[PDB]
Write a protein that binds this ligand. Structure first.
Ligand SMILES: CO[C@H]1CN(Cc2cn(-c3ccnc(Nc4ccc5c(c4)c(C(=O)C4CC4)cn5C)n3)nc2C)C[C@@H]1O
Ligand SMILES: CO[C@H]1CN(Cc2cn(-c3ccnc(Nc4ccc5c(c4)c(C(=O)C4CC4)cn5C)n3)nc2C)C[C@@H]1O
Ligand SMILES: CO[C@H]1CN(Cc2cn(-c3ccnc(Nc4ccc5c(c4)c(C(=O)C4CC4)cn5C)n3)nc2C)C[C@@H]1O
Ligand SMILES: CO[C@H]1CN(Cc2cn(-c3ccnc(Nc4ccc5c(c4)c(C(=O)C4CC4)cn5C)n3)nc2C)C[C@@H]1O
Lengths: 264, 263, 258, 253
């Protein structure tokens, strides 16, 4: 818990959402920070619970590809103070910067696989791995954020189940509510598709049950324009229907690493 | 014939046998495929002949419980098929001893549906065994491996005769080299026994002539542990010695469909 | 017939004439070759005359003849060399591996039998390994094309590999090669041991006429020893052809891998 | 474990992918400095510490503002880039250099190390007549109970047993050396241009090889093809390869 008097805030908001507001600021520990400010004095219990849960996960994680938490500030509203990733959500960035080269997209998504490989070996499932939850420190350095749905796996266990982002969820999540690192790997495939699609939403114009039927038939989203075949192959591997034949992040990270070194 | 440049292949092989290798891949049309890759650049003429005959039969077939062929590609000869990612049924059941009897019934019924289609299409498989059933999922089986399959002639009830899987052949196949859909029904009975035995090989430790002699005496493989009596009866019905009193696949399918509905 | 200036040879000999590793130029690329270098020449030319007519993955392909400082037979290289030597040096090649190789030999011999040629020197030393999983047949110095009006050729003598009708009547057919193939299998499962060790040619002939045969090599599967004995069927008409021999090995290998 | 205060660095980078010219302390040694995945630099240094040969880049040490690997300077830089910029180096000159590489590799072979990245880009020129081997990031010492090391993959330089079985020996380095020779006689051209890694593997399994570069003596192209012997046991070691280059250079000169 942090001292509101050591925190200063820029007036203009970086962005907004259903939870409230994100602002740039500075905190004396002076670090440049991104501050998630809950709307309406955090009257909404689901907003407080999410802030508490994502803060409790972040406190346990330490990895260069995961956003670091500074702390919580209970002031005029509840505030989650994190290290600033200046450029913001990856999907919004690619929508506004169509010039980013395919090699650059591989570098970024590979870094996300490194943060997810770290999460995998830490026994955490993210359960909300989408391009909007990747934040850019620079155009060549991405970090994973938004741990509000993240869970630590139990030693005797798949996590068995608020928000339900069905277009990123694997078949065993939809049908059995079972979440694993392999479930995150499927979401990572969707995220790769978003990135090579420069921030297009997946399964545009489809309802939840329409996506589920589509996947059960073995159909998948198509290859984004300009996406190299090896990357589209990797997306299809992440979209392996069966949980045991789906690769883990150790394998996914290794394939992205090896492929990047070949591009340059 | 396919374009090798549109085919990509995963490095680690899914399996291997005397023909060569089976790999996972992707082919642009982009479909996830299983690729049978002949060994030693397809130098062996019997392997090439089997792939050609395999592809020629599959091309004529279209059924949800039969593996679909994408095509053939010639660094080696490759048979590109739609992926059933869980692989051979016998190997799966050996690895998953927990599969429920109701689940076995579901899978074997799906096999009978593909065979009823094959029977109606005037094709004999002649290699119907558990290793030639491939699992799309644990609840969806397809028949593969049509290298011995034949189209029956319009002027014949059976095909009269490479590999000789004696343990799956009916008495008329052994004694008179006569193959019919009724002959495939006998093999289906051995397949059911394999599946309820969780992938055990049939007639463990017997020679061909010992199996033939045991069958002529009216003896049969025993009831696998945990197998419902009605299913073992159906096995024994499929193992009806006389060709005319053995049921065809229309009757075998309906029986499995009705016992499954009951369970 | 080949251009000596397009050929280069390594100094060290592979074996013994002399066999050398070398390289032959065809366009921008070089083909790795084995060269048989003569220490008559009519026998090399007859050997080349046979090989020119053959084209099969399980037969050594001839590049050509080079009349240079010495008479030379230029063949595609099978890097690993004679099969008998290889098994003497690699005592732990698996029986499944041996079956694979002898089956390849039988596929090479079925092609020869279908082309109306008799090899007449079919032995393990005349099987060359491209890899440990790929054998080719070499050494056609005694080979003959059967005339269209004859089912056998009537005539150095590798008697220990020869069928009784060769020894007693000078008749050589594809069935006669099948008998030699049986000796070759015995060599292969004996890891390059010589057949009938310590026996003169006259003593092998008498033992064969009596009905006696070489014993089962230690560790040899019984189905393969049976197949040797079938190849050693005394009567030529009851001895299998190579079509039947290849199918037998094909099915048994399938059994062993499964 | 070097003193940063004794090190000075030139402002402009020699190359990136960052490599800089610098000086390390009455006399100061001219150094090249690789300036940065941290564990992999320390492993690279752990290998270079054990080596001492005139045909291998000597490490001065590690300096912990960034992580730095400080090596003796080989002023002319990577061999492939050099030959791309100096198209008229004589084939006698090229043989001298690749033979020097074979002398460094024979030392590595005798020291039971496998380089695992032997390529023309990882040969640095002290002068046009003196080459050294660099870049030990993938290098491994062989265990005394093993003939090979069993495992970033420069697959176009890798032998089939590396690709097929993940096995790396000095013979595997001999294969890469054949590719390095092709690069050298092709004046820094990349091997198998326009081919995917999977396409190279299939070609090699087929028995096909890269062609003879223009102006390449036949005896050197033969030596490439010997280094590309598929079977590991019949592939020459570096003792034989070094001797072939030594005698052929004598013949040329
Ligand atoms: C699901 O929707 C959202 C929820 N989430 C919120 C969030 C941001 N966090 C963070 C941490 C460290 N640095 C940053 N930097 C940063 C820089 C420029 C930005 C944004 C964020 C920005 C936004 O956030 C708008 C609200 C979208 C817009 N611009 C231009 N953000 N932390 C969390 C939990 C991100 C996600 O996209
Ligand atoms: C030994 O005999 C074999 C010959 N035959 C080969 C074959 C596979 N085909 C196919 C078609 C579509 N999808 C598949 N998928 C699939 C998925 C995982 C698998 C296998 C196959 C797999 C194997 O195949 C090994 C060789 C057993 C192992 N794993 C783990 N296979 N098609 C044919 C003609 C099957 C039979 O069992
Ligand atoms: C004594 O009887 C001989 C006569 N014959 C000669 C011959 C070899 N030929 C050939 C063709 C293509 N590739 C090869 N490759 C090859 C590779 C490594 C080898 C040998 C051959 C090798 C030998 O040859 C020694 C002499 C045994 C030794 N090493 C180590 N050899 N072709 C013919 C007509 C083989 C038979 O064993
Ligand atoms: C994969 O690409 C690279 C990685 N590697 C890096 C490396 C260089 N090292 C070294 C040691 C001692 N002296 C030198 N001298 C030297 C002199 C002029 C040079 C270079 C190096 C130079 C470069 O290095 C650019 C990056 C290519 C450019 N110019 C013009 N370099 N050490 C290592 C580990 C070399 C390889 O080519």
């Amino acid at each position: 818990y942090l001292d509101r008097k050591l925190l200063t805030l820029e007036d203009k908001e970086l962005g907004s959402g259903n939870f409230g507001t994100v602002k740039k600021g500075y905190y004396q520990m002076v670090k440049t920070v991104a501050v998630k400010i809950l709307k309406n004095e955090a009257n909404d219990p689901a907003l407080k619970d999410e802030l508490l849960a994502e803060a409790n996960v972040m406190q346990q994680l330490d990895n260069p590809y995961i956003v670091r938490m500074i702390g919580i500030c209970e002031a005029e509203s509840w505030m989650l103070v994190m290290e600033m990733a200046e450029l913001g959500p990856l999907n919004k960035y690619l929508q506004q910067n169509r010039h980013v080269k395919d090699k650059n997209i591989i570098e970024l998504v590979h870094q996300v696989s490194m943060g997810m490989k770290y999460l995998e070996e830490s026994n955490f499932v993210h359960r909300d791995l989408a391009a909007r939850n990747v934040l850019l420190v620079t155009q060549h350095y991405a970090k994973i954020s938004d741990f509000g749905l993240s869970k630590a796996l139990r030693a005797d266990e798949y996590y068995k189940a608020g928000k339900w982002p069905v277009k990123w969820y694997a078949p065993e999540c939809i049908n059995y509510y079972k979440f694993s690192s392999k479930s995150d790997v499927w979401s990572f495939g969707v995220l790769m598709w978003e990135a090579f699609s420069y921030g297009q939403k997946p399964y545009r114009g489809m309802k939840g049950s329409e996506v589920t039927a589509m996947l059960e038939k073995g159909e998948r989203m198509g290859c984004p324009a300009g996406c190299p075949r090896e990357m589209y192959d990797l997306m299809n591997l992440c979209w392996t229907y069966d949980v045991e034949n789906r690769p883990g992040f150790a394998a996914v990270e290794l394939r992205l690493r090896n492929y990047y070194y070949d591009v340059v």
